[PDB]
């Protein structure tokens with residue numbers, strides 16, 4: 001039994017936390033949800049995801065294509081990609097926004113057993129083997145993966161877990 005419970009609103013918080021890990025630039029209803037999996041003993045958060053325009057968005061490794069219970073209703077997967085590590089439920093992919101490249105972002109981190117929180121940060125670019133990946137330099141536990149990363153205009157520009165390749 002894999003299910004979703006709501007974590008909070010998707011907003012750019014003006015008085016958000018600011019990380020010391022990076023340098024500064026200059027001196028059905030929508031929201032974030034915890035993807036859970038109940039067991040014999042207790043319950044355990046496997047990931048995070050975004051509900052937007054009647055479509056639930058998360059990463060493939062969280063659910064692995066499993067149907068999600070949502071209180072009374074049930075959510076079947078519509079589309080996915082294993083190599084990109086993405087999956088949508090109830091409709092096609094709707095998060096069309098992207099990082100501009102010259103701005104700070106807010107990670108709306110939704111960690112396991114802990115409240116949702118915005119952390120402001122400048123993304124770095126890391127030359128990995130087989131790509132220059134852009135990433136937010138913030139280590140959160142596994143189960144936080146799928147947490148949305150936001151721009152100043154409120155839009156989800158990426159999901160936390162794996163970085164983003166640049167070509």
Ligand SMILES: C[C@H](Cc1ccccc1)[n+]1c/c(=N\C(=O)Nc2cccc(C(F)(F)F)c2)o[nH]1
Nearest residue numbers: 099123134135136138139158160161162163164
């Ligand atoms: C700290 C750790 C570092 C790490 C990175 C990759 C592999 C292994 C380790 N890390 C980063 C992370 N996620 C993102 O940075 N995601 C993201 C997605 C789209 C867009 C943006 C952008 F807006 F910053 F560019 C970021 O998850 N973990």
